Amino acid sequence: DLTNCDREPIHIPGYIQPHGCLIACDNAMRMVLRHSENCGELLGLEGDLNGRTAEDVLGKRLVHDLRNALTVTRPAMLPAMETSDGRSFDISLHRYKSTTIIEFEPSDSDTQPLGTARKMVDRIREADSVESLISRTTRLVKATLGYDRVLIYRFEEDGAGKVVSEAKQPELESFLGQYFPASDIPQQARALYLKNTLRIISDASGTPIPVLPAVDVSGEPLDLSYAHLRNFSPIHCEYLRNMGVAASMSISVIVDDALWGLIVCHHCSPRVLSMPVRIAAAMFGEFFSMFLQVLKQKRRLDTINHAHAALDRFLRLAAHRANLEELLVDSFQDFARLIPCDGVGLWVGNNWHGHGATPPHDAIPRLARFVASVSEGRVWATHALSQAIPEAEIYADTAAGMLAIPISQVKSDYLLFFRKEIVQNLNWANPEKSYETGPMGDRLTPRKSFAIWKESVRLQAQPWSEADREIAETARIALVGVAFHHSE
Amino acid sequence: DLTNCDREPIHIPGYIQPHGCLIACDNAMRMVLRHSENCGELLGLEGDLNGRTAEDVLGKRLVHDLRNALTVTRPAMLPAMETSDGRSFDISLHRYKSTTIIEFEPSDSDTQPLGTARKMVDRIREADSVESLISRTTRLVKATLGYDRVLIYRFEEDGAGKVVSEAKQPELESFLGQYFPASDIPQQARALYLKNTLRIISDASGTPIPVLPAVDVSGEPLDLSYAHLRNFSPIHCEYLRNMGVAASMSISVIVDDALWGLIVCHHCSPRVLSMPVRIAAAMFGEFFSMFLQVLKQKRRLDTINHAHAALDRFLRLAAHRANLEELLVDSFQDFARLIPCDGVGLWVGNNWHGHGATPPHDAIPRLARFVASVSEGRVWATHALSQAIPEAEIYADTAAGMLAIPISQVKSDYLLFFRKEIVQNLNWANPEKSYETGPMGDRLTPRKSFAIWKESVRLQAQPWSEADREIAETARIALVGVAFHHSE
Numbered sequence A, B: 001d002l003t004n005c006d007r008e009p010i011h012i013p014g015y016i017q018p019h020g021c022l023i024a025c026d027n028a029m030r031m032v033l034r035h036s037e038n039c040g041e042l043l044g045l046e047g048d049l050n051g052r053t054a055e056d057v058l059g060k061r062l063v064h065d066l067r068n069a070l071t072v073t074r075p076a077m078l079p080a081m082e083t084s085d086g087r088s089f090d091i092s093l094h095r096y097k098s099t100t101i102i103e104f105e106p107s108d109s110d111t112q113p114l115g116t117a118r119k120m121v122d123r124i125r126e127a128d129s130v131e132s133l134i135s136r137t138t139r140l141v142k143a144t145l146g147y148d149r150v151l152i153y154r155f156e157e158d159g160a161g162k163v164v165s166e167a168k169q170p171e172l173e174s175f176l177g178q179y180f181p182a183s184d185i186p187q188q189a190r191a192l193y194l195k196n197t198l199r200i201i202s203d204a205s206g207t208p209i210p211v212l213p214a215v216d217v218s219g220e221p222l223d224l225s226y227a228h229l230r231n232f233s234p235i236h237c238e239y240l241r242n243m244g245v246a247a248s249m250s251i252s253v254i255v256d257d258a259l260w261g262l263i264v265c266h267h268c269s270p271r272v273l274s275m276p277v278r279i280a281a282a283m284f285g286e287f288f289s290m291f292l293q294v295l296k297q298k299r300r301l302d303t304i305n306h307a308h309a310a311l312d313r314f315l316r317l318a319a320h321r322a323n324l325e326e327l328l329v330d331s332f333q334d335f336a337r338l339i340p341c342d343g344v345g346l347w348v349g350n351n352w353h354g355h356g357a358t359p360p361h362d363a364i365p366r367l368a369r370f371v372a373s374v375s376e377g378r379v380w381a382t383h384a385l386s387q388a389i390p391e392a393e394i395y396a397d398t399a400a401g402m403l404a405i406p407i408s409q410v411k412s413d414y415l416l417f418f419r420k421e422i423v424q425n426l427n428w429a430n431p432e433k434s435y436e437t438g439p440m441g442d443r444l445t446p447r448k449s450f451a452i453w454k455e456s457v458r459l460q461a462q463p464w465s466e467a468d469r470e471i472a473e474t475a476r477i478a479l480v481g482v483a484f485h486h487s488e
């Protein structure tokens, strides 16, 4: 099924990843309800474990220490824990839907979990712009965790993902500046990714180990939402195998409690991160998120400060010039400085004055009449002009988006901002690389995903941000206010 | 009924105000469905009008011009229109719920509707602060429209109204700085006030003239939402009569599409504003709203700019000092500069350091433990501390509100901001004046309304604004970020 993607319940796969073993106990960790087939192979146990008491299975010495963890749904990390037979394991212990889930993996005592991160964070803390934090992060994460490719994948308004930063081995293909459909990361995944900060895929071509029982007596599956060993969707694993990506590690970037995007790592060989390096990467993820949040806030405060200053400058000029209509005709191009636009236009006294990428002179009367019907003396905007006026499809390559600012309360005069269709402004330079395809078809390749997105945004501009509308509303109040001062 | 206030359907009173007459016609203004009893007295008509055709009743010459108005639910203002018998009327014409409503009133051709407003707006446009716009507006509106009292009544988070500005005759009582319950202006009214910019009460002791029919054949009343003659609730009219207020004119202040508050005018004698002065006041209302919106935005941008600068200054100090714990103990009082607070405290290394109005030393351990349970490494805040900790009622007169900023990701260390209970910070200086009371009791007086509000906010502080939380979150990321840099 490669449609209704949001359907698949990824949280309850009924499988885990080979690189560790999973024991699910009751709410109070007394009786083993479920286990992973490989529990035997790794712990050195014989036979079925389901019905045996936690104290019996793992040991009275270990089960005691694990009870003190849950005394804290944030998974408790217990590095280098000992079994009765002496073997040493790193243990992830969490409690979700009144089910205690214990994950075991071969132990790492070499790496330091705080020290590693403290140095990584130190290098991104002093970044003074969103672009500087982002650029350095991919490069940094690659050098440190040694993944063949690191992307920052940022989510657009429409749910589509743009690759805004990339560090990679020279040999590998670049996805920098390419967009991907909202469907490529469906809604239940983003819901899960807001819960699980960090995520591993040890092997995309690995054999997934089943959890027994898959479904229990009461007829409910084992929710592996907060289980780091949870096996990933076969749709995504095929997608990674088609890209020649054997292993994966993604970090959830959380800004203002939204999912802003992912730090996504690819490895061409199989790769297991140890509990300690996964804690470090998780901490870096949190700090990277916090800094990007504050840098985004500073940019918003700056963008608007800069627009306020521009309008004060223009209101001081309007005090000196007698003819305001004359001042606007000489000045209107300068408003393209407030709101990112490919063109700006002035419709004043049934006359049209254009600058940059605007619709054709003959097409404006239609537009001016239309805006004057739906505006209602407030800011009107759209990124899909042709959806509002079919006639406007002809010039979508020039002006696909329009934001309209009324400049007179009384008269029907407008300041019109325009944007080219997003595929025009597209800067990726080509996806010449051909990709091998598995059972499910050529849909599961970056080449097709990109082709799909490009159709989904045809005749459509870069949407107007909250900041573009905030500035536009402030410009309306400034222009309407000073146009009243010069009444006829 | 002086409870469940939101019940009363003020929009369909089945009455109008004496100072004009009302004719409701069908959707296309052909047949007179309803009229006000006084239609006869003012238009010079005899008998019932309900069933007679619009062309017959008002005239073919007039009904034609009225059809061209609805060719525009914004009421069309038609000043100095003539009837068949020669009489001259100002006419408000609107169409709501497929019912054309025509309001007539004695004509004013003396006042200029734009010129008056253009001068008023000119005096508020150059205001550079919310306090300066507000202060000048009451004073200005009083001098111009000549009302005995003008208030600006601002709505609080909890729906309560504060009187933030006042111009009045020396003899009259001051309501400056007094709050009023959310119930005093119920929800259906605010819903109506978002629709009707401006509102008149010609006489609070006037005899309301009934609309016939009150309820029609189809069993639906006449919606007078956009009718300027709509009779006001008898609850409010009694309230005004108890205040010695004979007439009223309120203006809806709309900021970011919210109802921010009202410019409320009181007159001790009866007072009808003419259509032209009502248009002017309506225009001023719009401009006053637009400017206050932009001044509010500038203040928000400034408040946060100022907090960013403060934290950068503090992060530069943290680079020089080795012991960060020492720097915070010396500096924490300075954070009271970021967020308006009556006290600030530092809980670091199980030690307490206080500055300003904070809870007692002995009470902090309880607080520090509590915050450390519900915080979850993010900013936690409340204006009703005693609702979270009953024990905290004892010191509500000192600290009724608390905002808590984590300063360490690892350790349980907090920066605690405090606010006194709102009745402490209360600056109104007394309501000695006694008020006469009508049939419905002493509830309908400012004295009682204020007593009611004062109980509704006991043990409660001034709520933490979006701006206080925005700054607090930015301070968390700054302090948590630099505390990681100085790991143990």
Ligand SMILES: *C/C=C1/C(=C/C2=NC(=C\c3[nH]c(/C=C4\NC(=O)C(C=C)=C4C)c(C)c3CCC(=O)O)/C(CCC(=O)O)=C2C)NC(=O)C1C
Pocket (backbone or CB within 6 Å): A001, A002, A003, A004, A005, A008, A010, A151, A153, A175, A180, A183, A184, A185, A186, A189, A199, A231, A232, A233, A235, A236, A239, A248, A249, A250, A262, A264, A266, A443, A444, A446, A449
């Ligand atoms: C219709 C179903 C589809 C689908 C489902 C799906 N995708 C999921 C995760 C996921 N997808 C991406 C996409 C990319 N990663 C890349 O590196 C590139 C490179 C060009 C692309 C396009 C990513 C990053 C992820 C996140 C996986 C991770 O956390 O590492 C999932 C959720 C996986 C899970 O089981 O948790 C599902 C389901 N993807 C499709 O493309 C389609 C058609």
Ligand SMILES: *C/C=C1/C(=C/C2=NC(=C\c3[nH]c(/C=C4\NC(=O)C(C=C)=C4C)c(C)c3CCC(=O)O)/C(CCC(=O)O)=C2C)NC(=O)C1C
Pocket (backbone or CB within 6 Å): B001, B002, B003, B004, B005, B008, B010, B151, B153, B175, B180, B183, B184, B185, B186, B189, B199, B231, B232, B233, B235, B236, B239, B248, B249, B250, B262, B264, B266, B443, B444, B446, B449
């Ligand atoms: C339980 C019912 C009550 C109630 C209902 C009610 N109030 C309405 C309007 C209204 N109330 C105020 C309040 C004041 N105005 C003042 O000047 C002062 C001065 C101290 C106070 C406290 C105001 C300003 C208004 C707005 C009226 C206007 O637009 O001029 C209404 C709506 C009236 C209508 O029919 O449109 C209703 C209903 N008010 C109560 O106090 C109570 C108990």
